[PDB]
Structure formats: structure tokens, C-alpha cells
Amino acid sequence: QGSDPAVTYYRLEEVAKHNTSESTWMVLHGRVYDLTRFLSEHPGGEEVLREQAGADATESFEDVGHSPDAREMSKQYYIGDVHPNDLKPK
């Protein structure tokens, strides 16, 4: 019922738990990225990620205007999709 076996799903209330330097997950465009090993290598700094860790950071991501290389760089951190219950209705 909407459920691709190829896709692990994470509820947002779970993603919210990963908001620490020990484990930082973040949501971008309906997708969940584990950025823990990425923190120190993010050119915009750790702080800006930490401040939005455990949440949907899509808007902030897009407003900064990340580069194509930045988008390509994010893919290795993809660990699953946001549970459909927690996606916008429209």
C-alpha cells in the first residue's frame, strides 16, 4: 500500500531522536540522511546542521542555494524515506 520493499521507512518522531553529535539524521525532500560522519566536512559548518538536526531541513537547505556538487555529495548519506503518515497531505 505505497510501500516499496526497497525502501526502509522512518517515522519523524524517530528521526527527531538523532539530533546529537553521536548521531545526526536529517530530512531532505522526504528523504532521511545520516550526516554523522559528514558533520566535520560540511563547508557551512557543524552548527547550522546541529541546529536543524532531527528535523526536515529542506527549506533551509534550498535557501542557502547548495551547488550541484553539494547535492551529489548528499547521496552517500541517504538511509531511507520518511514514513508516508508523516508526509505533507498536499
Which one of Mg ion, ligand HEM, none interacts with residue 72, CB within 5 to 8 A by kind?
Mg ion
Under rule CB under 5 A, residue 63 binds Mg ion: no
72 binds Mg ion (CB under 5 A): yes
Closest-CA residue to 62 (of 71, 73, 50) = 71
Q: Which is nearer to ligand HEM, 11 or 29 (CB)?
A: 29
Please say whether the beta carbons of 37 and 73 come within 8 A: no
For residues 3 and 78, which CB has a smaller minimum distance to ligand HEM in the complex? Answer: 78
Strands (E), the chain: 9-10, 19-20, 23-28, 31-34, 78-82
29 known member of a binding site? no
The site for Mg ion (CB under 5 A) is made up of 72
